[PDB]
C-alpha cells in the first residue's frame, strides 16, 4: 500500500496527453503519441504497397494518391522509385517517364514502363507480359510540400 494524506471528502487528479492535431499519414485526429508510438508523420519520403499479390494475368496497374491519402498530393520530380519483390530500380526520368526491367522466374525478360503526373500524383504501369502469380509491387515517392503549403501536421 501507499500512504497519502486525506483531509476532505473529494480529491481531484489531472493529467495531460499528447495528441496528433492533424489527421495525416498513419495517425488520425485525436490519437495519442507516446513512447511506443510508431507511424509516418512529418516525414515527406514515404512508400506504399500497390499490389499485395499478383493474379498472374494482369498487364496494367495504376497508383493514385487519392487512395492512400485523402486528396491529390503533388510529387517532387526525379525522386520516385519502383520496388519489385523488394528490389528497387533507378529513379524516374525528369520529364515524365521511368524505365525498368526484371528477370522472370523461368528466366525470361520483362520490361516495365511508367507514366507520371506530378500535379495529382498519378502513376500508370504497363507490363510487356503478365508477371508470375506471387509478385508484389511497391512505390517510393516524396511529397512536394513546397507546392502545397498546407497539410503540415500539428500537435
Amino acid at each position: 500500500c501507499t500512504f497519502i494524506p486525506v483531509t476532505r471528502d473529494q480529491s481531484d487528479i489531472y493529467e495531460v496527453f499528447n495528441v496528433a492535431g492533424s489527421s495525416f499519414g498513419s495517425y488520425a485526429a485525436g490519437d495519442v503519441l507516446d513512447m511506443q508510438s510508431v507511424g509516418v508523420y512529418s516525414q515527406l519520403r514515404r512508400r506504399y504497397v500497390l499490389v499485395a499479390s499478383s493474379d498472374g494475368t494482369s498487364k496494367t496497374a495504376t497508383f493514385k494518391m487519392e487512395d492512400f491519402e485523402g486528396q491529390n498530393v503533388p510529387i517532387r520530380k526525379g525522386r520516385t522509385n519502383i520496388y519489385v519483390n523488394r528490389i528497387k530500380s533507378v529513379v524516374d526520368n525528369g520529364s515524365g517517364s521511368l524505365l525498368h526491367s526484371f528477370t522472370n522466374a523461368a528466366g525470361e525478360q520483362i520490361t516495365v514502363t511508367c507514366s507520371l503526373n506530378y500535379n495529382i500524383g498519378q502513376i500508370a504501369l504497363s507490363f510487356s507480359k503478365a508477371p508470375d502469380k506471387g509478385t508484389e509491387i511497391a512505390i517510393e515517392t516524396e511529397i512536394n510540400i513546397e507546392a502545397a503549403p498546407e497539410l503540415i501536421p500539428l500537435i
Binding site: 489531472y14 499528447n18 492535431g21 498513419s26 503519441l33 513512447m35 511506443q36 508510438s37 510508431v38 507511424g39 509516418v40 508523420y41 512529418s42 516525414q43 515527406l44 519520403r45 512508400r47 504497397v49 525522386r79 523488394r86 529513379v91 516524396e142 510540400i145 503540415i152 501536421p153 500539428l154 500537435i155
Partner: protein, 254 residues
C-alpha cells in the same frame, strides 16, 4: 579487361508545426499556471527526433531478404554450457555468412525481441555480459553484450505489435542481425544531416493566433551499392521433441 559503374545518393525533407490561441494560453496561465508555448516547443523538439529514430528502424526492418531458422528450446536433460556453445557456434556461422557475402569487415550488433532477450539473459556469466546497473524500461534500450563482440538491443513487445499491425512483419521471437562497416567507400546503412532543423516563430496573427514551425533536411536510407546484404533476419522456433519451453515450463510431446 576491366569495367566501371556508378551510384548516386540524395537526401529528403521533413516539416512539423504547432499552434495555439491567446485566450487558451491566458486561461491555462490563470487556472493551473502552465504555459502553452514552451510545452509545444518541447514536444515538437522531442517528437521530431523520436520519429526519425523510429523511421530508421522501420527502414532497416522493411528491406531485408536473408532469412534463417533455429530452435531455442533446451533439451530435457542437458546443462546450459553445452547449449550456450551451440548457440555461439550457430550465431558465429550466421555472422560469417554476412562477411562472406559483403567481403568486408566491421562492427557487430543485433536486434532482439522481448522473449529472445529474456532467453539471452539466462545464459551463464562468461557467455553473456549484462549492462552495468541495467534497469528495465519500455523503450528500445541496450541490455549488454554477449561473446564479447556483439552488442544487443531489446525491442519491447508493444513496439513489436505496433509494427505488426502495419505492413511491417515482426514477432517477439524474431531477431535481426547487422554489421556496421566503417570503410571509406563501403557502408551498410548511411545517415546524415544536410540541413539542421530551423525554428520559425511567427508574430501574433490579427486573429490572435500564435504559430511555430520547424523545417530541415536529412538523409536516412540504405546504401545504393550493395545495401541489404549487410542484414539477416533470424526467427526462433520453440517446438522439438523432449524439450522445455520457459514460457510455460512444460515438456513438449515427451
Amino acid at each position: 579487361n576491366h569495367e566501371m559503374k556508378k551510384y548516386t545518393l540524395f537526401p529528403s525533407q521533413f516539416v512539423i508545426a504547432a499552434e495555439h490561441t491567446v485566450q487558451a494560453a491566458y486561461e491555462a496561465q490563470r487556472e493551473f499556471g502552465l504555459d502553452l508555448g514552451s510545452l509545444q516547443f518541447r514536444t515538437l523538439k522531442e517528437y521530431l527526433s523520436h520519429e526519425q529514430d523510429m523511421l530508421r528502424l522501420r527502414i532497416m526492418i522493411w528491406r531485408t531478404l536473408a532469412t534463417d531458422t533455429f530452435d531455442i528450446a533446451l533439451p530435457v536433460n542437458q546443462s546450459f554450457d553445452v547449449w550456450a556453445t551451440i548457440i555461439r557456434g550457430k550465431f558465429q556461422t550466421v555472422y560469417r555468412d554476412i562477411i562472406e557475402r559483403v567481403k568486408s569487415s566491421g562492427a557487430m550488433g543485433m536486434f532482439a525481441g522481448a522473449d529472445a532477450a529474456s532467453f539471452f539473459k539466462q545464459l551463464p556469466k562468461d557467455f553473456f555480459q549484462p549492462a552495468e546497473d541495467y534497469i528495465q524500461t519500455p523503450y528500445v534500450h541496450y541490455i549488454g553484450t554477449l561473446f564479447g563482440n556483439v552488442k544487443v538491443y531489446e525491442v519491447p513487445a508493444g513496439i513489436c505489435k505496433n509494427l505488426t499491425t502495419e505492413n511491417i512483419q515482426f514477432s517477439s521471437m524474431d531477431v535481426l542481425c547487422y554489421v556496421r562497416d566503417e570503410n571509406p567507400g563501403k557502408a551498410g546503412f548511411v545517415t546524415g544531416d544536410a540541413v539542421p532543423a530551423i525554428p520559425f516563430q511567427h508574430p501574433t496573427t490579427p486573429a490572435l493566433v500564435n504559430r511555430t514551425t520547424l523545417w530541415g533536411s536529412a538523409i536516412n536510407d540504405m546504401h545504393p551499392r550493395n545495401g541489404a546484404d549487410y542484414f539477416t533476419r533470424v526467427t526462433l522456433t520453440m517446438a522439438k521433441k523432449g524439450g522445455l519451453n520457459f514460457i510455460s515450463g512444460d515438456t513438449i510431446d515427451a
